[PDB]
């Protein structure tokens, strides 16, 4: 095509790693970068489904407010740091994956110490789980699920093992979004919009993947205007 349709939003991408990814799109008519950028932003933060630690089970621990010998951190501080764990599974077949880890003695327990699982990957390896002294026995099973939004540990209440303790759900693989609308020049009229939105991701998913999912959630919603009543 040549005139108005060839003159189409040039989608340009710049993504480093699976965390950052800038997305530029121009030219746009009057005040459209804002009309597109804000919605997508509201989607990217709420809608995008993800992963979060749903439950944990220390072998000798019964409640959430206990302390394990040979381990500096307390069960609460540990379960906290687990919320920080960002895992990334590759397909729907993995709805609920239980990561297993057991370490003993004078060693630091990092997230890469979890025995690897076939379809699951951990992009948060060096995350500090705990500091083991001597005679430090830590054997736990940490549940992981795919969901959306925030789910209080009280709302779901998972119970794989009777003495396990649920943990608060943090399901947005996106930490922050940002979009700017700077003027762009098209030969004839100077009043134009250029929308560039920057997206940051925990690693679970990629900025590009997220954007695609976002636009989809928006389009699916634009179809819900079909049957009058």
């Amino acid at each position: 095509m040549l005139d108005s349709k060839l003159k189409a939003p040039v989608f340009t991408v710049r993504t480093q790693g699976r965390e950052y990814g800038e997305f530029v799109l121009e030219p746009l008519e009057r005040g459209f970068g804002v009309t597109l950028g804000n919605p997508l932003r509201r989607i990217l933060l709420s809608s995008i489904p993800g992963t979060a630690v749903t439950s944990v089970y220390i072998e000798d621990v019964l409640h959430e407010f206990s302390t394990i010998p040979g381990v500096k951190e307390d069960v609460v501080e540990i379960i906290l740091n687990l919320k920080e764990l960002v895992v990334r599974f590759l397909n729907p077949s993995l709805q609920t994956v239980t990561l297993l880890l057991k370490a003993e003695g004078p060693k630091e327990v990092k997230a890469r110490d979890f025995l690897p699982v076939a379809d699951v990957e951990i992009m948060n390896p060096d995350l500090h789980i705990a500091t083991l002294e001597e005679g430090g026995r830590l054997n736990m099973e940490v549940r992981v699920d795919r969901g959306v939004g925030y789910v209080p540990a009280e709302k779901h209440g998972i119970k794989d093992r009777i003495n396990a303790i649920p943990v608060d759900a943090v399901f947005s693989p996106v930490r922050r979004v940002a979009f700017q609308v700077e003027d762009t020049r098209l030969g004839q009229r100077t009043d134009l919009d250029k929308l560039t939105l920057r997206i940051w991701t925990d690693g679970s998913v990629t900025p590009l993947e997220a954007l695609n999912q976002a636009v989809e959630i928006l389009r699916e919603h634009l179809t819900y205007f079909s049957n009058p009543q």
């Binding site: 800038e22 804002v34 932003r41 700017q180 609308v181 700077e182």
Partner: protein, 97 residues
């Protein structure tokens, strides 16, 4: 704004409009560059903020900052008290829990 300059982008249409309404206000000396004006405005303790619900800016600079805020103790006075029926005093026959 320094990292913003290098990260690759300048000022918004949003950031510029609030500036107009800001100089019409008397928060920034008229005639200086938006880069220089936002600084003056920033020194005033307020920056530009977008609604979040609309994406549009909030006409006029709004101050923002790190404020230390504590949570007050939740007494059994907070944890509400609603009564249907219940005990009664032994000598006076008025309700008591």
């Amino acid at each position: 704004f320094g990292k913003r300059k290098g990260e690759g982008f300048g000022v918004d249409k949003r950031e510029v409009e609030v500036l107009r309404r800001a100089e019409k206000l008397g928060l920034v000396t008229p005639g200086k560059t938006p880069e220089e004006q936002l600084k003056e405005l920033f020194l005033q303790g307020k920056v530009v903020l977008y609604d979040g619900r609309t994406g549009e800016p909030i006409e006029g600079p709004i101050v923002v900052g790190q404020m230390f805020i504590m949570k007050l103790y939740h007494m059994v006075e907070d944890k509400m008290h609603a009564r249907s029926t219940g005990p009664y005093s032994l000598i006076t026959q008025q309700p008591l829990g």
